[PDB]
Scaffold this active site. Structure first.
Site, PDB file in Angstrom:
ATOM      1  N   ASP A  75       2.774  -7.883   7.214  1.00  0.00           N
ATOM      2  CA  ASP A  75       1.618  -7.256   6.582  1.00  0.00           C
ATOM      3  C   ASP A  75       0.460  -8.147   6.147  1.00  0.00           C
ATOM      4  O   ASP A  75      -0.225  -7.836   5.173  1.00  0.00           O
ATOM      5  CB  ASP A  75       2.071  -6.424   5.382  1.00  0.00           C
ATOM      6  CG  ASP A  75       1.080  -5.334   5.033  1.00  0.00           C
ATOM      7  OD1 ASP A  75       0.812  -5.128   3.832  1.00  0.00           O
ATOM      8  OD2 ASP A  75       0.572  -4.682   5.970  1.00  0.00           O
ATOM      9  N   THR A  76       0.229  -9.248   6.851  1.00  0.00           N
ATOM     10  CA  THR A  76      -0.888 -10.116   6.498  1.00  0.00           C
ATOM     11  C   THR A  76      -1.834 -10.241   7.688  1.00  0.00           C
ATOM     12  O   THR A  76      -2.863  -9.565   7.733  1.00  0.00           O
ATOM     13  CB  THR A  76      -0.404 -11.517   6.030  1.00  0.00           C
ATOM     14  OG1 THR A  76       0.379 -12.136   7.058  1.00  0.00           O
ATOM     15  CG2 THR A  76       0.431 -11.386   4.761  1.00  0.00           C
TER      16      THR A  76
ATOM     17  N   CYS B  98      -0.648 -20.329   0.251  1.00  0.00           N
ATOM     18  CA  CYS B  98       0.039 -19.773   1.404  1.00  0.00           C
ATOM     19  C   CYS B  98       0.763 -20.793   2.269  1.00  0.00           C
ATOM     20  O   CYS B  98       0.198 -21.818   2.645  1.00  0.00           O
ATOM     21  CB  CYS B  98      -0.960 -19.009   2.265  1.00  0.00           C
ATOM     22  SG  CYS B  98      -0.226 -18.272   3.727  1.00  0.00           S
ATOM     23  N   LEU B  99       2.014 -20.490   2.593  1.00  0.00           N
ATOM     24  CA  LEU B  99       2.826 -21.360   3.429  1.00  0.00           C
ATOM     25  C   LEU B  99       2.744 -20.954   4.894  1.00  0.00           C
ATOM     26  O   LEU B  99       3.154 -21.709   5.778  1.00  0.00           O
ATOM     27  CB  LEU B  99       4.285 -21.319   2.972  1.00  0.00           C
ATOM     28  CG  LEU B  99       4.573 -21.988   1.628  1.00  0.00           C
ATOM     29  CD1 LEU B  99       6.024 -21.755   1.234  1.00  0.00           C
ATOM     30  CD2 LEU B  99       4.279 -23.475   1.731  1.00  0.00           C
ATOM     31  N   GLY B 100       2.220 -19.762   5.158  1.00  0.00           N
ATOM     32  CA  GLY B 100       2.122 -19.318   6.534  1.00  0.00           C
ATOM     33  C   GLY B 100       0.722 -19.397   7.106  1.00  0.00           C
ATOM     34  O   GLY B 100       0.468 -18.857   8.178  1.00  0.00           O
TER      35      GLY B 100
ATOM     36  N   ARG C 229       0.865  -1.183   0.000  1.00  0.00           N
ATOM     37  CA  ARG C 229       0.000   0.000   0.000  1.00  0.00           C
ATOM     38  C   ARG C 229       0.903   1.234   0.000  1.00  0.00           C
ATOM     39  O   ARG C 229       0.914   2.008   0.957  1.00  0.00           O
ATOM     40  CB  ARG C 229      -0.887   0.019   1.251  1.00  0.00           C
ATOM     41  CG  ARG C 229      -1.901  -1.123   1.338  1.00  0.00           C
ATOM     42  CD  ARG C 229      -2.700  -1.033   2.636  1.00  0.00           C
ATOM     43  NE  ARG C 229      -1.810  -1.107   3.790  1.00  0.00           N
ATOM     44  CZ  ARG C 229      -1.213  -2.219   4.211  1.00  0.00           C
ATOM     45  NH1 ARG C 229      -1.421  -3.372   3.591  1.00  0.00           N
ATOM     46  NH2 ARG C 229      -0.355  -2.165   5.221  1.00  0.00           N
TER      47      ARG C 229
HETATM   48  C1  HEM Z   1      -4.108 -13.522   7.158  1.00  0.00           C
HETATM   49  C2  HEM Z   1      -2.912 -13.982   6.802  1.00  0.00           C
HETATM   50  C3  HEM Z   1      -2.457 -14.399   5.361  1.00  0.00           C
HETATM   51  C4  HEM Z   1      -3.081 -14.401   4.178  1.00  0.00           C
HETATM   52  C5  HEM Z   1      -4.533 -13.979   3.775  1.00  0.00           C
HETATM   53  C6  HEM Z   1      -2.123 -14.913   3.179  1.00  0.00           C
HETATM   54  C7  HEM Z   1      -2.411 -15.056   1.826  1.00  0.00           C
HETATM   55  C8  HEM Z   1      -1.522 -15.553   0.903  1.00  0.00           C
HETATM   56  C9  HEM Z   1      -1.848 -15.661  -0.551  1.00  0.00           C
HETATM   57  C10 HEM Z   1      -3.181 -15.228  -1.163  1.00  0.00           C
HETATM   58  C11 HEM Z   1      -0.797 -16.173  -1.153  1.00  0.00           C
HETATM   59  C12 HEM Z   1      -0.653 -16.473  -2.677  1.00  0.00           C
HETATM   60  C13 HEM Z   1       0.065 -15.396  -3.487  1.00  0.00           C
HETATM   61  C14 HEM Z   1       0.135 -15.763  -5.015  1.00  0.00           C
HETATM   62  O1  HEM Z   1      -0.359 -16.794  -5.415  1.00  0.00           O
HETATM   63  O2  HEM Z   1       0.739 -14.842  -5.605  1.00  0.00           O
HETATM   64  C15 HEM Z   1       0.257 -16.405  -0.067  1.00  0.00           C
HETATM   65  C16 HEM Z   1       1.642 -16.953  -0.280  1.00  0.00           C
HETATM   66  C17 HEM Z   1       2.575 -17.081   0.714  1.00  0.00           C
HETATM   67  N1  HEM Z   1       2.440 -16.770   2.051  1.00  0.00           N
HETATM   68 FE1  HEM Z   1       0.692 -16.127   2.958  1.00  0.00          FE
HETATM   69  N2  HEM Z   1      -0.904 -15.219   3.810  1.00  0.00           N
HETATM   70  C18 HEM Z   1      -1.080 -14.897   5.148  1.00  0.00           C
HETATM   71  C19 HEM Z   1      -0.082 -15.027   6.129  1.00  0.00           C
HETATM   72  C20 HEM Z   1       1.215 -15.484   5.936  1.00  0.00           C
HETATM   73  C21 HEM Z   1       2.225 -15.541   6.961  1.00  0.00           C
HETATM   74  C22 HEM Z   1       2.023 -15.105   8.446  1.00  0.00           C
HETATM   75  C23 HEM Z   1       3.363 -16.033   6.382  1.00  0.00           C
HETATM   76  C24 HEM Z   1       4.785 -16.311   6.996  1.00  0.00           C
HETATM   77  C25 HEM Z   1       5.424 -15.284   7.519  1.00  0.00           C
HETATM   78  C26 HEM Z   1       3.044 -16.290   4.971  1.00  0.00           C
HETATM   79  C27 HEM Z   1       3.955 -16.803   4.020  1.00  0.00           C
HETATM   80  C28 HEM Z   1       3.650 -17.006   2.682  1.00  0.00           C
HETATM   81  C29 HEM Z   1       4.605 -17.509   1.669  1.00  0.00           C
HETATM   82  C30 HEM Z   1       6.089 -17.888   1.979  1.00  0.00           C
HETATM   83  C31 HEM Z   1       3.940 -17.548   0.508  1.00  0.00           C
HETATM   84  C32 HEM Z   1       4.448 -17.982  -0.898  1.00  0.00           C
HETATM   85  C33 HEM Z   1       4.092 -19.327  -1.438  1.00  0.00           C
HETATM   86  C34 HEM Z   1       4.684 -19.567  -2.910  1.00  0.00           C
HETATM   87  O3  HEM Z   1       4.796 -18.539  -3.585  1.00  0.00           O
HETATM   88  O4  HEM Z   1       4.906 -20.730  -3.121  1.00  0.00           O
HETATM   89  N3  HEM Z   1       1.729 -15.953   4.718  1.00  0.00           N
HETATM   90  N4  HEM Z   1      -0.221 -16.020   1.153  1.00  0.00           N
HETATM   91  C1  LIG Z   2       0.353 -11.600  -1.757  1.00  0.00           C
HETATM   92  C2  LIG Z   2       1.143 -11.938  -0.420  1.00  0.00           C
HETATM   93  C3  LIG Z   2      -0.028 -11.781   0.627  1.00  0.00           C
HETATM   94  C4  LIG Z   2       1.971 -13.248  -0.392  1.00  0.00           C
HETATM   95  C5  LIG Z   2       2.673 -13.286   1.017  1.00  0.00           C
HETATM   96  C6  LIG Z   2       3.042 -11.754   1.195  1.00  0.00           C
HETATM   97  C7  LIG Z   2       2.447 -11.121  -0.156  1.00  0.00           C
HETATM   98  C8  LIG Z   2       2.331  -9.592  -0.073  1.00  0.00           C
HETATM   99  C9  LIG Z   2       3.420 -11.601  -1.346  1.00  0.00           C
HETATM  100  O1  LIG Z   2       4.208 -10.889  -1.921  1.00  0.00           O
HETATM  101  C10 LIG Z   2       3.074 -13.096  -1.528  1.00  0.00           C
END
Ligand code: HEM
Ligand SMILES: CC1(C)[C@@H]2CC[C@@]1(C)C(=O)C2
Ligand SMILES: [K+]
Length: 405
Positions: free
Chosen positions: A242-243, A348-350, A177
């Protein structure tokens, strides 16, 4: 500022939606994005905003595109194009087959095996933060809990000083943002400027923190390079800062405005996990996309190689075609369909860490502060972008109605 319409885009598909400042933002950000699902709007539209790009507006198309990585590449996943091109985080900026090998390493530092391990620290921080706020009868939720709870847990896991949060949070926010002072590329370089020395230090003398693990990790049998480690750690930082930080505020705002839903979870605590899922659907907040790898006809629309297409993860679950009465929060909703955590190979991995943080927050907050509301005369303002959020969330409550555990 509307970019000139490309030669292959017909005018009947033009809908100038601005993902960084949507027209109906005052009604709530999810509501603002939902205008893309009104009867008069095509399934796939072209907006001249932010450089010009397509937008899939229905869950069916969003899911199909995320599954078809051969046509919809994650190499340039962000809008505007400058940001998508500068974006090089791993594994997100890679398509399978290359992408796969990096997910296992990321899972090692933010996956389930790590969550069950941080269980106690997460539990204790939530309770400590909430108990300190409880007797005050008020709080600025975004800065008093939404930010410190998940961010301090991430900084602990990453072995980074809490005093570095203001700087890192600012940079992360410029990538999702932007306030206009920094381009995505400048924010990314600043984040890497921070990480490079740390990664080298931890490759020299390994620790047990997430950065040390990634920096000294292996990807499918071979050593990860310093560059790859940097690109992965950068992504983990953005995810940790930022999630969940934003999602918690959407959820608490809703609970503050709906006493009936609060009572339901207080009387039937066993419904919290299900409530977490329904809230993840209703207050979905991410919207990134892909780039066309070749000319392709998708649902009757001619897309050209290089075209960017926004595939709002937020919209699938709000699609009436996926969930009836989408704007309603039903903790007993039979089938909660959504793509809040993504779809396809980049799931998502987190999400395990995220769900833990959400469920712990719901349980521990309602246990101590069952009755609370939006501060007198407050008008809650949202913000939109790659990840949407709440600008401020002033809450109030009568301390006499609280419980110290
Ligand atoms: C409310 C919390 C969260 C939401 C809604 C969320 C949502 C997402 C979404 C929609 C993607 C897919 C992006 C794409 O396909 O371009 C993603 C990927 C990912 N997220 Fe989350 N996320 C959250 C929290 C977290 C947290 C806390 C972590 C770890 C610090 C995390 C780590 C990752 C990683 C490493 C990926 C990449 C997977 C890949 O590209 O193979 N996420 N997340
Ligand atoms: C779209 C996301 C929510 C996902 C984890 C952090 C984020 C901003 C990325 O760049 C991949
Ligand atoms: K790129």
């Amino acid at each position: 500022n509307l970019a000139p319409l490309p030669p292959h885009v017909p005018e009947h598909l033009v809908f100038d939606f601005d993902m960084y400042n949507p027209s109906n933002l005052s009604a709530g950000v999810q509501e603002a994005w939902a205008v893309l699902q009104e009867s008069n709007v095509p399934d796939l539209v072209w907006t001249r905003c932010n450089g010009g790009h397509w937008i899939a507006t229905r869950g069916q198309l969003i899911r199909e595109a995320y599954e078809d990585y051969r046509h919809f590449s994650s190499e340039c996943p962000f809008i505007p194009r400058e940001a998508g091109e500068a974006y090089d985080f791993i594994p997100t900026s890679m398509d399978p087959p290359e992408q796969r090998q990096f997910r296992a390493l990321a899972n090692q530092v933010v996956g389930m095996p790590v969550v069950d391990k941080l269980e106690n620290r997460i539990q204790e921080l939530a309770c400590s933060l909430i108990e300190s706020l409880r007797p005050q009868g008020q709080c600025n939720f975004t800065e008093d809990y939404a930010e410190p709870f998940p961010i301090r847990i991430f900084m602990l896991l990453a072995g980074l000083p809490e005093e570095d949060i203001p700087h890192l949070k600012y940079l992360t926010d410029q990538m999702t943002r932007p306030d206009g002072s920094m381009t995505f590329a400048e924010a990314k370089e600043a984040l890497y400027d921070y990480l490079i020395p740390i990664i080298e230090q931890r490759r020299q003398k390994p620790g047990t923190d997430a950065i040390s693990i990634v920096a000294n990790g292996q990807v499918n049998g071979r050593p990860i390079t310093s560059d790859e480690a940097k690109r992965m750690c950068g992504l983990l930082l953005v995810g940790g800062l930022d999630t969940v930080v934003n999602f918690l505020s959407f959820s608490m705002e809703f609970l503050a405005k709906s006493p009936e839903h609060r009572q339901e979870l207080i009387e039937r605590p066993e419904r919290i996990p299900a409530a977490c899922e329904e809230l993840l659907r209703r207050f979905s907040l991410v919207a990134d996309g892909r780039i066309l790898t070749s000319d392709y006809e998708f649902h009757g629309v001619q897309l050209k190689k290089g075209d960017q297409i926004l595939l709002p993860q937020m919209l699938s679950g709000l699609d009436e075609r996926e969930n009836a009465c989408p704007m309603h929060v039903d903790f007993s909703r039979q089938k909660v369909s959504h793509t809040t955590f993504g779809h396809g190979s980049h799931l998502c991995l987190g999400q395990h860490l995220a769900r833990r943080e959400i469920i712990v927050t719901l349980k521990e907050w309602l246990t101590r502060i069952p009755d609370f509301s939006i501060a007198p005369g407050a008008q809650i303002q949202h913000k939109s972008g790659i990840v949407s959020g709440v600008q401020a969330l002033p809450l109030v409550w009568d301390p006499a109605t609280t419980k110290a555990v």
